Design a protein around this ligand. Structure first.
Ligand SMILES: CCCCCCCCCCCCCCCCCC(=O)OC[C@H](COP(=O)(O)OCCN)OC(=O)CCCCCCCCCCCCCCCCC
Ligand SMILES: CCCCCCCCCCCCCCCCCC(=O)OC[C@H](COP(=O)(O)OCCN)OC(=O)CCCCCCCCCCCCCCCCC
Ligand SMILES: CCCCCCCCCCCCCCCCCC(=O)OC[C@H](COP(=O)(O)OCCN)OC(=O)CCCCCCCCCCCCCCCCC
Ligand SMILES: CCCCCCCCCCCCCCCCCC(=O)OC[C@H](COP(=O)(O)OCCN)OC(=O)CCCCCCCCCCCCCCCCC
Ligand SMILES: CCCCCCCCCCCCCCCCCC(=O)OC[C@H](COP(=O)(O)OCCN)OC(=O)CCCCCCCCCCCCCCCCC
Ligand SMILES: CC(C)CCC[C@@H](C)[C@H]1CC[C@H]2[C@@H]3CC=C4C[C@@H](OC(=O)CCC(=O)O)CC[C@]4(C)[C@H]3CC[C@]12C
Ligand SMILES: CC(C)CCC[C@@H](C)[C@H]1CC[C@H]2[C@@H]3CC=C4C[C@@H](OC(=O)CCC(=O)O)CC[C@]4(C)[C@H]3CC[C@]12C
Ligand SMILES: CC(C)CCC[C@@H](C)[C@H]1CC[C@H]2[C@@H]3CC=C4C[C@@H](OC(=O)CCC(=O)O)CC[C@]4(C)[C@H]3CC[C@]12C
Ligand SMILES: CC(C)(C)NC(=O)CN1CCC(CNC(=O)c2cc(F)cc(Cl)c2)CC1
Ligand SMILES: *[C@@H]1O[C@H](CO)[C@@H](O)[C@H](O)[C@H]1NC(C)=O
Ligand SMILES: *[C@@H]1O[C@H](CO)[C@@H](O)[C@H](O)[C@H]1NC(C)=O
Ligand SMILES: *[C@@H]1O[C@H](CO)[C@@H](O)[C@H](O)[C@H]1NC(C)=O
Ligand SMILES: *[C@@H]1O[C@H](CO)[C@@H](O)[C@H](O)[C@H]1NC(C)=O
Ligand SMILES: [Ca+2]
Ligand SMILES: [Ca+2]
Length: 1014
């Protein structure tokens, strides 16, 4: 009996190794001998399992029912295989064979029972997820159906000659990824057929003037709003915050500029207060589900503590293209330190006994370090000098206690990481059968051929980075119903399975006298806050294209004087009366502002002066002291960081250690030859004959300076895939990179993404745990049928389908009038108004009858009315679905908890806009004069994201704060002093904006976790 449970697990290991080596390209035919042996193995495997179900039928509840479903899906395969005519859709069902392991492994079965016990409480946030997909889905179909099909065409009478080979509409350089999408004369839009570039004789690009709907949508047909099906694929890509910016820029070009409001709202409501609401429910219910269940004279000890850290620091300056006299000085420095720790071993071996030298567990590690290092001194060994950084651990006890508890965690999450590698493997087999050899086929890097590149792709999709690029391949190569793979992969992986890991961690850790009178006065703290807000208007008004001798420059020149005088007079009042840190901050800002007046009165002075203007952008932070809600919160945030100060130290150390490891593997390798054909190019001088350009990559590992930026762009996960591609291709110092040259470098880039995600997740739980200590039933079916009849509207719907939804709109409005008059009978004019929902019900029926009698007038054509009001009325028809709010009694209790903690959120949010203000001001000052034209290309900036003035810098820093292509913006700043400035600007913005947004999530969770206690 007990040997039966372990011998069943050995056959499942034999079934995973059989599914893994599937080889989808060559297994179209069974002619290979390797394919035929595997088939026999599968047949034997099926037989063992089938027999095992009979022996269990000597004596199900849940897991035998999964075990019975798989053998039935097996028998259906061998039944069709006999008579030789079949489809190839039931083969894919054997992906569910590694699911058997969950019952066998006794630690996985207990974990997935707790997962299936908390998912019923997760149904209220999927009820909210329906309102977001339906409200933002129907509006998007009302606005932008068929507007991404339109191009600039020729005129219809215009005959074209037979030989020019022009497409009859303006094709760009990459027609699928970014076509030229114009605005019709009906709409406003941001693009018109006027701005078509001259053709590079006779140019036919001036004749494309007819903006008309074409035949295909961008990204090979996957991004459009013609249906409620395709609208949910676009909205789901906005929820994950990956590529939502390319969707908004299509809509800005074709419909109007003001379409940005729709996008800002969907990220706040959906991508932030709905995705993080799924974390709070799982992290609460999991916590309630389990609770339901002379050499030590300290001068020699301080002598070695500097001797390790000086040795380690020296390694940091590897520096590509060094003098070589520095390398000789580096190797002599190896001889001096390694002889010293040979000497330290020689003293501790003589004064202390060798019976007690091995008895100390730290000493043996040091001893090994000597025999490895000394042996190498008297490559792979020169890389082992980084391991000597681990000798700091004996000399300090605080990270000894932190590295102990951090490894107690890896005992607790070991059963999670086994269930996580079952999840990645099962979706990787499924990707090989569904997609296989059907992509661009040179074939693209993100294929589902060859299981190793199927596991990396599924891991990559899980990290939410260029996953839309994988979606658009699979939708265009099988069918548009292949989006359900990527929705199932990412909802079940990121939104239930990652939040389980947070839930495991959370439960695991647990004159002069009168001058003092006005300072006391309450309105003095308020009247100066108006003067601060009046000064914020004249920071936003600054921009590079103001004339120096104008009516606006003298308003910015003179108002500089009246504010600098009144903040100086505000300070010399307090010094007379009073005689804190926030008073120090206010004095330095006026100290900066007075000197800038004097330096301006004098005229390399400008270079010195330039610095003063940057300092002036910090004027907006004066309000933190004045506002009482902003002062408590900032202090609390600063206070919260102390507990996880040790985890940051280990994490700050780890960036250095993978930083010096990164330089020593990748030093001077990241050079590439940008040219025309570049296929017969092997090295550097080969480009010198072809007159191409031997260009360096923007993110690289030449020194420790460039490496710590390449590791930040990995850790923020934006554009990390392209950096991993550069390390896989890296062949030599002056050598042309070859595609997939060293595939073992996946161990460098994926171990860094996993360890960083472990510290950040342990910094998160450390901050959380310290902060802890039959009428209306008939109206439900009518609304549930109105939801259907609004989603049936689509682009180019027939006249029979169009007229039928008009008659249905006639009978829903009438029986909303009827159910309001009938309910007024039993209540009688007072209880119908004393209720709150009847004031919401009758207001909907009012707006429904308001538009239905006004659309009749246009069909009457008695007055040629504005068709704008017909459309607005149509969009406001979506209001009918709200009447489901009263019914959803469990979802409204979930939103009421958020309201309790809403006050804290408002304070955090207001600090979120001081970050945008200061940064936006800085951006105009730093990045305002640069341009993206046809002469100068840009990877991240363009017609829709500049720093040209304050308003456009406020939207770009919204796009950076979500982390969608923030690094392509950074690559455009250092395209041409921006070598030092542009790293400091973006790292200070991303580390601060994410820390403010995490505290919004921490503040919501504490209001919900404590309500579950009391
Ligand atoms: C829930 C809504 C159910 C009714 C949806 C519906 O019937 O919409 C019809 C829609 C349009 O028909 P269509 O395939 O696009 O024909 C091309 C036009 N020449 O047909 C569709 O294509 C809509 C398909 C998406 C249906 C929703 C998918 C939800 C999956 C989860
Ligand atoms: C602290 C402990 C630090 C240990 C560092 C160990 C580094 C060993 C590096 C050995 C080496 O030289 O090759 C690494 C290998 C690339 O293969 P290679 O044949 O050498 O390519 C041609 C190079 N001219 O590619 C690799 O396998 C690198 C793997 C790095 C894994 C780091 C894991 C950190 C946890
Ligand atoms: C309509 C059905 C249809 O059109 O099928 C087409 C497609 C296969 O077509 P294919 O041969 O691969 O390529 C030809 C290009 N037209 O057939 C398909 O693409 C069907 C595949 C759709 C993807 C379904 C994914 C659902 C998987 C759920 C995830 C959970 C799985 C459990 C783990
Ligand atoms: C105010 C000053 C605070 C300075 C920061 C201190 C540590 C910040 C805490 C980081 C954090 O908790 O959030 C990390 C965040 C994870 O969220 P992610 O999903 O990846 O964001 C993408 C947008 N959807 O993703 C990140 O951006 C983390 C970036 C890696 C930095 C690790 C911590 C470095 C500490 C030095
Ligand atoms: C939210 C704040 C966003 C600020 C903003 O985006 O407005 C400034 C914006 C940029 O200014 P501009 O360069 O002139 O581009 C207009 C091209 N037609 O355009 C403007 O100057 C005027 C747009 C201001 C209207 C904002 C109303 C927002 C209401 C949200 C609800
Ligand atoms: C918070 C959620 C649950 C409630 C529903 C939010 C949206 C469905 C509504 C809220 C206000 C609406 C916006 C108000 C301002 C307009 C300007 C309008 O631009 C135009 O000037 C029309 C141009 C033309 O005529 O072609 C385009 C739609 C838009 C963005 C609307 C898009 C849909 C919005 C975002
Ligand atoms: C763990 C958190 C803090 C993220 C990692 C920190 C880095 C993202 C930040 C910290 C200070 C910054 C660095 C401060 C010093 C400079 C040196 C500077 O040197 C060069 O430009 C040399 C150019 C060449 O190779 O020719 C490059 C930017 C750099 C490395 C900065 C890059 C980004 C840095 C490393
Ligand atoms: C080691 C830890 C404790 C400090 C954190 C890293 C940075 C804050 C410091 C320490 C090591 C410094 C680097 C040491 C080696 C040099 C090489 C130096 O070489 C050049 O100027 C480029 C010359 C060329 O391109 O040929 C540029 C600055 C740089 C990267 C330094 C930039 C600033 C660094 C990264
Ligand atoms: C900080 C806090 C807690 C508020 N929110 C997050 O941290 C959200 N983040 C986790 C999910 C996404 C990345 N998800 C993975 O990287 C990933 C990779 C895998 F291989 C497996 C899994 Cl389950 C997930 C985005 C970042
Ligand atoms: C624009 O092009 C479409 C199709 O190419 C045509 O039907 C329409 O009449 C054209 N409009 C004008 C004004 O030429
Ligand atoms: C060409 O001429 C008219 C304009 O007079 C244009 O509107 C139409 O599309 C064409 N008509 C015919 C008959 O080709
Ligand atoms: C590249 O090399 C191959 C093999 O020598 C040759 O046939 C081909 O013409 C070369 N291409 C160019 C552009 O020189
Ligand atoms: C560079 O590549 C060419 C291949 O065309 C090779 O012949 C040459 O030896 C290489 N090395 C140099 C020029 O140092
Ligand atoms: Ca991205
Ligand atoms: Ca991203």
């Amino acid at each position: 009996n007990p040997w039966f449970e372990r011998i069943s697990m050995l056959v499942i290991l034999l079934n995973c190794v059989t599914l893994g080596m599937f080889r989808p390209c060559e297994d179209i035919a069974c002619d290979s001998q390797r394919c035929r042996i595997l088939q026999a193995f599968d047949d034997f495997i099926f037989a063992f399992f089938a027999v095992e179900m009979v022996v269990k039928m000597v004596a199900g509840d849940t897991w035998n029912r999964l075990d019975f479903f798989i053998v039935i899906a097996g028998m259906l395969e061998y039944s069709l295989d006999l008579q030789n005519v079949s489809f190839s859709a039931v083969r894919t069902v054997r992906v569910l064979r590694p699911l058997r392991a969950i019952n066998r492994v006794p630690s996985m079965r207990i974990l997935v029972t707790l997962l299936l016990d908390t998912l019923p409480m997760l149904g209220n946030v999927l009820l909210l997820c329906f309102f977001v997909f339906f409200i933002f889905g129907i509006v998007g179909v009302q606005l932008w159906a068929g507007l991404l099909r339109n191009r600039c065409f020729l005129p219809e009478n215009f005959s074209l000659p037979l030989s020019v080979d022009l497409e009859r509409y303006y094709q760009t350089e990459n027609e699928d990824e970014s076509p030229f999408i114009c605005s019709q004369p009906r709409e406003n839009g941001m693009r018109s057929c006027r701005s078509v570039p001259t053709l590079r004789c006779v140019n036919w690009n001036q004749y494309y003037t007819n903006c008309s709907a074409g035949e295909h949508n961008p990204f090979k047909g996957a991004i459009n709003f013609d249906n409620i099906g395709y609208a949910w694929i676009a909205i789901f890509q906005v929820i994950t915050l990956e590529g939502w910016v390319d969707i908004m820029y299509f809509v800005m070009d074709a419909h109007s500029f003001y379409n940005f409001i729709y996008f800002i709202l969907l990220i706040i409501v959906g991508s932030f207060f709905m995705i993080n609401l799924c974390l709070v429910v799982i992290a609460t219910q999991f916590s309630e589900t389990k609770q339901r269940e002379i050499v030590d004279s300290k001068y020699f000890g301080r002598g070695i503590m500097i001797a390790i850290l000086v040795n380690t620091l020296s390694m940091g300056i590897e520096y590509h293209e060094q003098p070589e006299e520095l390398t000789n000085a580096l190797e002599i420095s190896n001889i001096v330190f390694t002889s010293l720790f040979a000497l330290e071993m020689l003293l501790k071996l003589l004064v202390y006994g060798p019976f007690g030298y091995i008895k100390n567990p730290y000493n043996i590690f040091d001893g090994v370090i000597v025999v490895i290092s000394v042996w190498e001194i008297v490559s792979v060994l020169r890389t082992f000098r980084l391991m000597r950084v681990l000798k700091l651990v004996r000399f300090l006890p605080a990270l000894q206690r932190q590295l102990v508890v951090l490894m107690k965690t890896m005992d607790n999450v070991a059963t999670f990481c086994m269930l996580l590698m079952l999840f990645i493997f099962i979706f990787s087999i499924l990707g090989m059968h569904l997609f296989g050899c059907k992509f661009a086929s040179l074939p693209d890097r993100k294929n589902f051929d060859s299981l190793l590149w199927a596991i990396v792709t599924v891991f990559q999709i899980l990290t939410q980075e260029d996953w839309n690029k994988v979606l658009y391949n699979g939708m265009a190569s099988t069918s548009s119903w292949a989006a359900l793979y990527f929705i199932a992969l990412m909802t079940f992986g990121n939104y239930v399975l990652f939040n389980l890991l947070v839930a495991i961690l959370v439960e695991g850790f647990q004159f002069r006298l009168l001058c003092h009178r006005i300072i006391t006065h309450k309105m003095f703290d308020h009247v100066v806050l108006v003067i601060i807000f009046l000064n914020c208007i004249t920071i936003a008004m600054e921009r590079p294209k103001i004339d120096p001798h104008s009516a606006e420059r003298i308003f910015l020149t003179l108002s500089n004087y009246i504010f600098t005088a009144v903040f100086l007079a505000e300070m010399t009042v307090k010094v007379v009366a009073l005689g804190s840190s926030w008073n120090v901050l206010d004095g330095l800002l006026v100290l900066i502002s007075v000197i800038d007046i004097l330096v301006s009165m004098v005229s390399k002075i400008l270079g010195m002066l330039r610095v003063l203007r940057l300092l002036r952008t910090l004027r907006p932070l004066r309000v933190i002291s004045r506002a009482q809600g902003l002062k408590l919160v900032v202090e609390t945030l600063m206070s919260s960081l102390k507990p996880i100060g040790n985890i940051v130290v280990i994490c700050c150390a780890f960036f250095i250690i993978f930083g010096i490891l990164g330089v020593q593997l990748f030093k001077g390798k990241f050079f590439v030859c940008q040219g025309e054909d570049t296929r017969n190019i092997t090295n550097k001088s080969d480009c010198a004959e072809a007159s191409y350009r031997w260009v360096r990559h923007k993110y690289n590992f030449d020194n420790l300076g460039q490496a710590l930026m390449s590791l930040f762009v990995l850790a923020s996960k934006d554009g990390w895939v392209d950096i991993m591609y550069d390390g896989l291709d890296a062949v030599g110092v002056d050598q042309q990179p070859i595609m997939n040259h060293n595939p073992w470098m996946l161990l460098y880039f994926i171990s860094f993404l996993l360890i960083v995600a472990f510290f950040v997740l342990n910094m998160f739980v450390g901050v959380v745990v310290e902060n802890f200590h039959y009428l209306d039933l008939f109206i439900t079916g009518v609304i549930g049928l109105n939801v259907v009849t609004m989603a049936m509207e689509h682009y180019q719907q027939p006249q029979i389908l169009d007229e039928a939804l008009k008659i249905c709109n006639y009978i829903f409005t009438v029986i909303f009038v009827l159910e309001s008059v009938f309910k007024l009978v039993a209540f009688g004019f007072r209880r119908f108004f004393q209720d709150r929902w009847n004031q919401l019900d009758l207001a909907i029926v009012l707006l429904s009858i308001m538009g239905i009698t006004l659309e009749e007038i246009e069909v009457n054509a008695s007055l040629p009315i504005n068709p704008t009001i017909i459309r607005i009325m149509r969009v406001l028809r979506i209001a009918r679905v709200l009447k489901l709010l009263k019914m959803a009694v469990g979802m409204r209790a979930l939103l009421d908890t958020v309201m309790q903690a809403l006050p804290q959120v408002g304070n955090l949010g207001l600090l979120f806009m001081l970050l945008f203000f200061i940064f936006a001001a800085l951006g105009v000052e730093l990045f305002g004069d640069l341009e993206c034209d046809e002469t100068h290309p840009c990877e991240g900036l363009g017609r829709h994201a500049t720093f040209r003035n304050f308003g456009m810098a406020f939207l770009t820093l919204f796009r950076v704060s979500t982390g969608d292509n923030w690094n392509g913006i950074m690559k455009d700043t250092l395209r041409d002093y921006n070598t030092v400035i542009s790293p400091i600007y973006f790292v200070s913005f991303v580390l601060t904006a994410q820390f403010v947004l995490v505290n919004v999530v921490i503040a919501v969770l504490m209001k919900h976790l404590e309500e579950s206690n009391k």
